[PDB]
Amino acid sequence: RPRFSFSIAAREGKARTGTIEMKRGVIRTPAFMPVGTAATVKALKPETVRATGADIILGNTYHLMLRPGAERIAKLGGLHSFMGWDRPILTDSGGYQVMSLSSLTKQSEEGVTFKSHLDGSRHMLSPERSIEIQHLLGSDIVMAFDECTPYPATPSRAASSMERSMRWAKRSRDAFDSRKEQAENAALFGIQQGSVFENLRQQSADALAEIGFDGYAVGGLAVGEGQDEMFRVLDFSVPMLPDDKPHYLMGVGKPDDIVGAVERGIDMFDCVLPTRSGRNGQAFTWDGPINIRNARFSEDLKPLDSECHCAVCQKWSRAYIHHLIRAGEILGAMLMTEHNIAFYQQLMQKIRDSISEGRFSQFAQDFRARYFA
Amino acid sequence: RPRFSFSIAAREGKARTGTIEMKRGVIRTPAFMPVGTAATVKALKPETVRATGADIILGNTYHLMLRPGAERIAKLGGLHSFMGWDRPILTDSGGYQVMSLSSLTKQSEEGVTFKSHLDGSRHMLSPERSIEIQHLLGSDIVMAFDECTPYPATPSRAASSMERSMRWAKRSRDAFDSRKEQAENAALFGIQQGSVFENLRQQSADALAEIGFDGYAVGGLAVGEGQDEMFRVLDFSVPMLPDDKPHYLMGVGKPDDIVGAVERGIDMFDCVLPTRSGRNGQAFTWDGPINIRNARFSEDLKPLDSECHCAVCQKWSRAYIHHLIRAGEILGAMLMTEHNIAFYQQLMQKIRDSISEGRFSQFAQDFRARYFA
Ligand SMILES: [Cl-]
Ligand SMILES: [Cl-]
Ligand SMILES: [Zn+2]
Ligand SMILES: [Zn+2]
């Protein structure tokens, strides 16, 4: 099997569909990655994650380096063996989560020193340490160590932040290439920064393309800017990236965010929304989200969604799941999560099929008209 | 399929093994019933409950009448359809749980009035209402409405309590027999009381046998008396019950409690221990229980138990489950629960096989020597 081979089978406008072939499996694009921060997709066995249609999951350098530890996972055989998922795993590099979750941080050209949110102990991240951690975990897609610029930012602060990220991108490339086993078996993605500014996004794309990566993420979005502004930035930013490599929009998003981002050339997505909001009682349907705890569902015998093919919708009613979530029962979290991840995967499948068949424009219009009715 | 047919295939001493045939399936005895108080065996899909080997699960009149409500469950098609378990369900009658969990109760010859532990609202239980609720739920094995005498009790207080329970047993019989669909499709078990007193246990057995039931439970135990005293009471109490009907020890118990109770003629068991203590980090093994959160398991690649055939032990290490439970991850609760229920079912299987093969005495000795080493 290839280390990493991306093939575009069809296009419609800026939208693309195809496959990434890797040693541990094929990734169909556009792809949605369920989030598995602490070496588990919350409330699902890996076999259930696979049954929903997921080809790849996301893990986190920041969380795993703190608990259970990167060296410990490596001693136990790597992340895949540890959690029982034998297909591709992409790991974020720590650059975003350290600044989001740490109580205290010190930032410099070398990297970031920080206090753990679990117990206050002191730790360090850098391009070299992030790549090493991802090696110890056995990631298949390694993310460069970057800085996610806060929003809003002045042009000059966005520029200096982006420039640091580009120096860190080169250090990430070099650290990855030095580790022969990692360079032979994994892939490395760079992360574009530049906040909402077209000229900075161009400078960042140029720097990443000069280094060369297997894929290119659009970083620095889903940080409070809202959909209109995110789409405006995507309109000019995605065309700056190499066309022949995958484009990954980090942390996005709601179903309509995904559809619009695909219309703008994005191939890969991750988001906690289906898992987290599932546990909180929000179920996705083709007619929009529903709050299953609402009293209107107490005697509703219909499945969560009338068309969904998932195992939850084949077997259990809204009324039962309403009861489980209101009672705080673990099975409620399990069933809501499986349905929401299955729904996300069915959305990605309809996106892939409609692009391949040259009817994605109509799909997006029909999707929105019904979802927002 | 028969409504209810018990057949004893083999005996060793006081121990028996056989089958109860019912419309919704066969129950192999001695049997362990996982507890599914709120219309779910906590953290398991019904298909997973079945995969562990369980033939029957337990539900609770008290919890279900409060949430989601008995009439609501009946409107939605009955408990089996609601939760997705199509095999036999035994429901406790409310007599124990109302006194265990209610904040305020009023007891009389008619029944028990009480305040719900969920919201304080006022409700009533009685022999007639308990049987009606169990009818609305669609229980397969209906328990008589009784009173679980507190421990310790004076002989005279135990006697007056037991006598009330025996009058309630006759009222339960009559209410059940009046409901033609219930009498045709379900079974009714009586509950022996009498605290720790041989003469009262005899009077209670005589009263229940005169009425006639499909099965006979030993009530009033697992109320703080300890194993030595529970076994002493079982020594004289079980032989008082009709030999040709199943004997059900309510709320028991730890693995050694089950083995000793089988040696004294018990055929059926239920207990929250495998589920509840599983979620808390206790795993059962043939070498005794372990606390998976203990630091000694942080890098242990062995399964929870070295012989167990369950899906958890085929796929995941102690080290991974240690991480999940310490992190508060739902998958930890799921995996611990599946293993513990599977372990309980494997214990029951070894008990059944050893009785059938006439080597149960040796099995009990070998079990204890290793479990308590
Ligand atoms: Cl999540
Ligand atoms: Cl439980
Ligand atoms: Zn579904
Ligand atoms: Zn096991």
PDB file of C-alpha atoms in Angstrom, chain B residues 62-173:
ATOM      1  CA  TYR B  62     -40.806   1.776  41.249  1.00  0.00           C
ATOM      2  CA  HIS B  63     -38.397   3.528  38.884  1.00  0.00           C
ATOM      3  CA  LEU B  64     -40.446   3.003  35.724  1.00  0.00           C
ATOM      4  CA  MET B  65     -43.739   4.168  37.230  1.00  0.00           C
ATOM      5  CA  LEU B  66     -42.025   7.486  38.028  1.00  0.00           C
ATOM      6  CA  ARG B  67     -40.056   7.882  34.799  1.00  0.00           C
ATOM      7  CA  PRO B  68     -41.109   7.535  32.018  1.00  0.00           C
ATOM      8  CA  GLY B  69     -44.412   6.238  33.478  1.00  0.00           C
ATOM      9  CA  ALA B  70     -46.213   2.920  33.102  1.00  0.00           C
ATOM     10  CA  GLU B  71     -49.100   4.179  30.945  1.00  0.00           C
ATOM     11  CA  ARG B  72     -46.585   5.947  28.681  1.00  0.00           C
ATOM     12  CA  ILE B  73     -44.546   2.772  28.194  1.00  0.00           C
ATOM     13  CA  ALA B  74     -47.743   0.843  27.414  1.00  0.00           C
ATOM     14  CA  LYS B  75     -48.778   3.476  24.860  1.00  0.00           C
ATOM     15  CA  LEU B  76     -45.362   3.136  23.210  1.00  0.00           C
ATOM     16  CA  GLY B  77     -45.794  -0.634  22.852  1.00  0.00           C
ATOM     17  CA  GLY B  78     -44.514  -2.056  26.138  1.00  0.00           C
ATOM     18  CA  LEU B  79     -41.126  -2.231  27.807  1.00  0.00           C
ATOM     19  CA  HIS B  80     -39.640  -4.805  25.393  1.00  0.00           C
ATOM     20  CA  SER B  81     -40.292  -2.687  22.291  1.00  0.00           C
ATOM     21  CA  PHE B  82     -39.361   0.548  24.087  1.00  0.00           C
ATOM     22  CA  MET B  83     -35.868  -0.575  25.120  1.00  0.00           C
ATOM     23  CA  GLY B  84     -35.214  -3.092  22.332  1.00  0.00           C
ATOM     24  CA  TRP B  85     -34.919  -6.274  24.418  1.00  0.00           C
ATOM     25  CA  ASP B  86     -37.182  -9.026  23.031  1.00  0.00           C
ATOM     26  CA  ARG B  87     -36.414 -11.760  25.601  1.00  0.00           C
ATOM     27  CA  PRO B  88     -37.877 -12.311  29.095  1.00  0.00           C
ATOM     28  CA  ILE B  89     -37.958  -9.462  31.610  1.00  0.00           C
ATOM     29  CA  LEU B  90     -38.610  -9.939  35.346  1.00  0.00           C
ATOM     30  CA  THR B  91     -39.876  -6.830  37.169  1.00  0.00           C
ATOM     31  CA  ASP B  92     -39.550  -6.261  40.885  1.00  0.00           C
ATOM     32  CA  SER B  93     -42.867  -5.133  42.364  1.00  0.00           C
ATOM     33  CA  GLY B  94     -41.864  -1.895  44.090  1.00  0.00           C
ATOM     34  CA  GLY B  95     -42.122  -3.213  47.643  1.00  0.00           C
ATOM     35  CA  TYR B  96     -38.388  -2.897  48.382  1.00  0.00           C
ATOM     36  CA  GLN B  97     -37.408   0.122  46.272  1.00  0.00           C
ATOM     37  CA  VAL B  98     -40.206   2.366  47.595  1.00  0.00           C
ATOM     38  CA  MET B  99     -38.860   1.977  51.135  1.00  0.00           C
ATOM     39  CA  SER B 100     -35.214   2.167  50.038  1.00  0.00           C
ATOM     40  CA  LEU B 101     -35.400   5.313  47.889  1.00  0.00           C
ATOM     41  CA  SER B 102     -38.481   7.401  48.792  1.00  0.00           C
ATOM     42  CA  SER B 103     -37.983  10.461  50.990  1.00  0.00           C
ATOM     43  CA  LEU B 104     -41.364  10.052  52.700  1.00  0.00           C
ATOM     44  CA  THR B 105     -43.652   7.033  52.959  1.00  0.00           C
ATOM     45  CA  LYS B 106     -46.944   6.119  54.604  1.00  0.00           C
ATOM     46  CA  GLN B 107     -47.463   2.368  55.100  1.00  0.00           C
ATOM     47  CA  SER B 108     -50.852   0.748  55.734  1.00  0.00           C
ATOM     48  CA  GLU B 109     -52.757  -2.442  54.997  1.00  0.00           C
ATOM     49  CA  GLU B 110     -53.830  -0.941  51.669  1.00  0.00           C
ATOM     50  CA  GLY B 111     -50.270  -0.307  50.438  1.00  0.00           C
ATOM     51  CA  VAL B 112     -47.671   2.473  50.478  1.00  0.00           C
ATOM     52  CA  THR B 113     -48.065   6.167  49.665  1.00  0.00           C
ATOM     53  CA  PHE B 114     -44.794   7.938  48.945  1.00  0.00           C
ATOM     54  CA  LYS B 115     -42.951  10.970  47.628  1.00  0.00           C
ATOM     55  CA  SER B 116     -40.831  10.462  44.528  1.00  0.00           C
ATOM     56  CA  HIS B 117     -37.079  10.823  44.926  1.00  0.00           C
ATOM     57  CA  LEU B 118     -36.973  12.655  41.580  1.00  0.00           C
ATOM     58  CA  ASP B 119     -39.340  15.579  42.238  1.00  0.00           C
ATOM     59  CA  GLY B 120     -41.336  14.989  45.448  1.00  0.00           C
ATOM     60  CA  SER B 121     -44.678  14.293  43.745  1.00  0.00           C
ATOM     61  CA  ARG B 122     -47.051  11.887  45.502  1.00  0.00           C
ATOM     62  CA  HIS B 123     -47.699   8.330  44.322  1.00  0.00           C
ATOM     63  CA  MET B 124     -49.263   5.086  45.512  1.00  0.00           C
ATOM     64  CA  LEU B 125     -48.363   1.410  45.360  1.00  0.00           C
ATOM     65  CA  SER B 126     -50.476  -1.579  46.396  1.00  0.00           C
ATOM     66  CA  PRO B 127     -50.801  -5.215  45.342  1.00  0.00           C
ATOM     67  CA  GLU B 128     -53.388  -4.253  42.728  1.00  0.00           C
ATOM     68  CA  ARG B 129     -51.537  -1.196  41.402  1.00  0.00           C
ATOM     69  CA  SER B 130     -48.182  -3.016  41.295  1.00  0.00           C
ATOM     70  CA  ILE B 131     -49.669  -5.875  39.263  1.00  0.00           C
ATOM     71  CA  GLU B 132     -51.391  -3.361  36.959  1.00  0.00           C
ATOM     72  CA  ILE B 133     -48.127  -1.468  36.403  1.00  0.00           C
ATOM     73  CA  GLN B 134     -46.321  -4.706  35.627  1.00  0.00           C
ATOM     74  CA  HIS B 135     -49.115  -5.560  33.166  1.00  0.00           C
ATOM     75  CA  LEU B 136     -48.733  -2.169  31.427  1.00  0.00           C
ATOM     76  CA  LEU B 137     -44.966  -2.730  31.210  1.00  0.00           C
ATOM     77  CA  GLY B 138     -45.503  -6.192  29.709  1.00  0.00           C
ATOM     78  CA  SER B 139     -43.285  -8.038  32.206  1.00  0.00           C
ATOM     79  CA  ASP B 140     -42.809 -11.773  31.641  1.00  0.00           C
ATOM     80  CA  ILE B 141     -42.144 -12.598  35.318  1.00  0.00           C
ATOM     81  CA  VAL B 142     -44.260 -10.497  37.656  1.00  0.00           C
ATOM     82  CA  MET B 143     -43.264 -10.229  41.323  1.00  0.00           C
ATOM     83  CA  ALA B 144     -45.854 -10.101  44.083  1.00  0.00           C
ATOM     84  CA  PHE B 145     -46.056  -6.807  45.984  1.00  0.00           C
ATOM     85  CA  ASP B 146     -44.371  -7.382  49.351  1.00  0.00           C
ATOM     86  CA  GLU B 147     -42.609  -5.671  52.262  1.00  0.00           C
ATOM     87  CA  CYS B 148     -38.889  -6.229  52.808  1.00  0.00           C
ATOM     88  CA  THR B 149     -38.580  -6.267  56.606  1.00  0.00           C
ATOM     89  CA  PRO B 150     -35.715  -4.081  57.915  1.00  0.00           C
ATOM     90  CA  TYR B 151     -32.744  -5.831  59.475  1.00  0.00           C
ATOM     91  CA  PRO B 152     -32.498  -6.405  62.388  1.00  0.00           C
ATOM     92  CA  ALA B 153     -36.114  -6.870  63.473  1.00  0.00           C
ATOM     93  CA  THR B 154     -37.688  -8.300  66.593  1.00  0.00           C
ATOM     94  CA  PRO B 155     -39.490 -11.627  66.086  1.00  0.00           C
ATOM     95  CA  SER B 156     -42.851  -9.960  66.631  1.00  0.00           C
ATOM     96  CA  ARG B 157     -42.202  -7.102  64.188  1.00  0.00           C
ATOM     97  CA  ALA B 158     -40.852  -9.596  61.643  1.00  0.00           C
ATOM     98  CA  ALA B 159     -43.989 -11.687  62.123  1.00  0.00           C
ATOM     99  CA  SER B 160     -46.461  -8.841  61.621  1.00  0.00           C
ATOM    100  CA  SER B 161     -44.497  -7.639  58.578  1.00  0.00           C
ATOM    101  CA  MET B 162     -44.395 -11.131  57.069  1.00  0.00           C
ATOM    102  CA  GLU B 163     -48.127 -11.603  57.696  1.00  0.00           C
ATOM    103  CA  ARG B 164     -48.908  -8.386  55.822  1.00  0.00           C
ATOM    104  CA  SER B 165     -46.730  -9.576  52.951  1.00  0.00           C
ATOM    105  CA  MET B 166     -48.670 -12.859  52.861  1.00  0.00           C
ATOM    106  CA  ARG B 167     -52.011 -11.035  52.670  1.00  0.00           C
ATOM    107  CA  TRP B 168     -50.483  -8.886  49.899  1.00  0.00           C
ATOM    108  CA  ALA B 169     -49.319 -12.075  48.154  1.00  0.00           C
ATOM    109  CA  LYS B 170     -52.915 -13.312  47.957  1.00  0.00           C
ATOM    110  CA  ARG B 171     -54.062  -9.906  46.670  1.00  0.00           C
ATOM    111  CA  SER B 172     -51.259 -10.033  44.066  1.00  0.00           C
ATOM    112  CA  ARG B 173     -52.351 -13.517  42.947  1.00  0.00           C
TER     113      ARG B 173
END
